[PDB]
Amino acid sequence: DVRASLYSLMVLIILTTLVGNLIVIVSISHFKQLHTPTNWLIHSMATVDFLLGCLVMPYSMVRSAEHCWYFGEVFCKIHTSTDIMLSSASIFHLSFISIDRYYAVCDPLRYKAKMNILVICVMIFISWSVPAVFAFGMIFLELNFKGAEEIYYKHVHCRGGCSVFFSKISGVLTFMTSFYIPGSIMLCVYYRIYLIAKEQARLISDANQKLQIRKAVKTLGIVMGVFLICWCPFFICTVMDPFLHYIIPPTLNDVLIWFGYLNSTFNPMVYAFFYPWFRKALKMML
Amino acid sequence: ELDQLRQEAEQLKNQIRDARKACADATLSQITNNIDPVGRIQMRTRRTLRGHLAKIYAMHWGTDSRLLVSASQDGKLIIWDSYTTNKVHAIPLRSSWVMTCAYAPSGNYVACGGLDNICSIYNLKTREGNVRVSRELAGHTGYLSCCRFLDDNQIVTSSGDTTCALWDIETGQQTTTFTGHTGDVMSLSLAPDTRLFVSGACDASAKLWDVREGMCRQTFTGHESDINAICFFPNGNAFATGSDDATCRLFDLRADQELMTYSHDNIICGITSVSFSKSGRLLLAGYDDFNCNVWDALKADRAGVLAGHDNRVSCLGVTDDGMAVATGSWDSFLKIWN
């Protein structure tokens, strides 16, 4: 009935995300003409998405399907920590790609001398490391609820699935460490790039119009709209819940958490398959 | 006397076509047809030599194999070891445009020079383990296109001033000058006898010079575009020539005529390099469409494709003993096949 359709759409999501991420990984790894350091960041993001598709989403799927947790508490803790690490990894990779494009299209002369493989390797290391420590410290060191315990024991008085509980301080700490800073950086960088592109396009248009006798807004808009629509509502609800008295039905929460997965699905079709050179290389594979 | 000169020359040349055509009685394709096909010879890449930073323009095997030297646009004349894929020398050039490269027949000297107008000689072995320039041959007025070693004390150079000159490296002074070409020459292949060589210019022609008397003896025509590469037959009776019209030709020094020709309608690019194997039955050739076809020297049937490169193949050379082929490309990777 409803559950069968739910399984159909969800397994479609897992299969499509796995296929896309695997294709991107294989295309970047096998070819030798695509080895510039930016493609290494793209490949790392693709592997993050592939792991996120291979590990957590089946169990989230079954949980959301039957609203019950047929597993152990330690397994649930592992699941939660892995989910928190693998979302922050993707967000950090998006922010680093944005910074790379900023250096590319704002300081053209000193681009290949400041974006060497060492900097990209350090970027990947700091992208994979900090989320791991942060998530495992919050979950295993029982720090997400350490502030208050009476509310937590009221929270576990009912239901019985392992839902993530965030205090008034832990919630704001998570909000201002995984969403706010990368979002602000992406906003500023892409606004500056938009201004520069607009000025250059206007000059070119003027010159060619005189001698004769908007891709920037269509490109940056797609990326920013996808990222914002897929991430913002979830983090807004997550941060607002602790301040209120937790009166938000999970019927919103499951959709919000599935938007993040859907974003992870929509990454290689905005960062890899949208540019002409990647499609040319893939066709040359044939 | 101008009109008399023109009429006499044109009558003599009309006679010389008749003389060439009189010798012809059949074709080599008809003569060999009754020979079994070569087969489906297949080559698998063994090792890849990496370390260059730009597009290789030349390479040259040593005298006893196991060594090869390559020149790039970076300005490094790296000398590899062909068994351990290691490096023995990293001689840094002065000019950053070299289009020639020539390992000495004895293993002592290396020559390299391009748009600098100067041919330089490098001394590999000295009292200490350091390589330094020994001489700088000057006197040309155009870009160097080819240079080959005749012995330890003589070098032959082919430049862009439409002249070929023979040098003598003890004093840096010319000995003989070969003139008569209209366009620029970009191919200079010596002969095993070390007494004759040919040059292929851009005028779609080729000549046979003599090192002993210093004047032309044979004029070969038949192409419709510039000549990119040339190479003798192991026996020493014929040579192969490549052009920009996707055509390969096997001229003859005995009958003074164009013999059987290679062609294929699916290729529209230009030949870049041509060489023969030891026996003289396989004729490898390069192409601008990113592969290296291998022809049959007798029946003209493609016996394989040496694909695996990413950009244009610029130069290739078959080793002396015959157990190794190597192709350089603009991919900055040398690939030593088998």
């Binding site: 002369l109 592109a197 | 862009g160």
Partner: protein
């Protein structure tokens, strides 16, 4: 064995040197300097300093430029031009005060017509189809002295000068005389027309007014290279 160790150590030394040379090689830009013999290429090169290629290495704003005088080569069929398919720009020095002066070959036409033919050949070359051209124009004061002091006018040698009006973009900041700016902006029109006939947004042309001895040429080259590389980067990400 001991033989292997020496070879491995030598290979390690060579790789260590090649790493430094790779680090050095990525921070330099290569520029060609095609031009006419009588034009002031030598003066500009000597200023940047303070028998074929005479490569000169200068430096401005912590970046290194690598510039090449290639005037020693011969004429026609231009087969060396294939190699310079990775440079950033092609400086093109042309002397404007040569409308009357004729090259040594009396049969040959005016030097300006030869410069136009060379520019057409360079611009329409199939190999140089993705590189911009930084067009210069030297001998500015000589042209002014020629035009002001009567003598043979441009109409004698250039017939179309009569059907010409000064454009609306002319900015005579020095404000010397309006009879010179007319010819100065007329000279640009031929090269711009040669440049605008082809196109499709793959390579541009940056004209300039300068003298042989004056400064700011390095700054102009710097700005033009910045703009060229910025547009090249912008067009990869499907932004421009």
């Amino acid at each position: 064995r001991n033989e292997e160790k020496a070879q491995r150590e030598a290979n390690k030394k060579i790789e260590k040197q090649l790493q430094k040379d790779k680090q050095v090689y990525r921070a330099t830009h290569r520029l060609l300097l095609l031009g006419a013999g009588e034009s002031g290429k030598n003066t500009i090169v000597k200023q940047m300093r303070i028998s074929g290629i005479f490569e000169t290495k200068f430096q401005v704003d912590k970046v290194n430029f690598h510039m090449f005088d290639v005037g020693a080569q011969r004429d026609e069929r231009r087969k060396w031009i294939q190699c310079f398919n990775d440079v950033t720009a092609i400086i093109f020095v042309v002397a404007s005060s040569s409308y009357n002066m004729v090259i040594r070959e009396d049969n040959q036409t005016n030097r300006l017509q030869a410069a136009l033919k060379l520019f057409d050949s360079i611009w329409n070359n199939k190999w140089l189809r993705d590189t911009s051209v930084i067009l210069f124009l030297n001998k500015q004061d000589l042209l002014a002295e020629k035009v002001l002091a009567g003598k043979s006018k441009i109409e004698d040698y250039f017939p179309e000068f009569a059907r010409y009006t000064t454009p609306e973009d002319a900015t005579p900041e020095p404000g010397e005389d309006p009879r010179v700016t007319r010819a100065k902006y007329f000279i640009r029109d031929e090269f711009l027309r040669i440049s605008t006939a082809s196109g499709d947004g793959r390579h541009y042309c940056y004209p300039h007014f300068t003298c042989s001895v004056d400064t700011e040429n390095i700054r102009r080259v710097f700005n033009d290279c910045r703009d060229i590389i910025q547009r090249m980067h912008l067009r990869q990400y499907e932004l421009l």
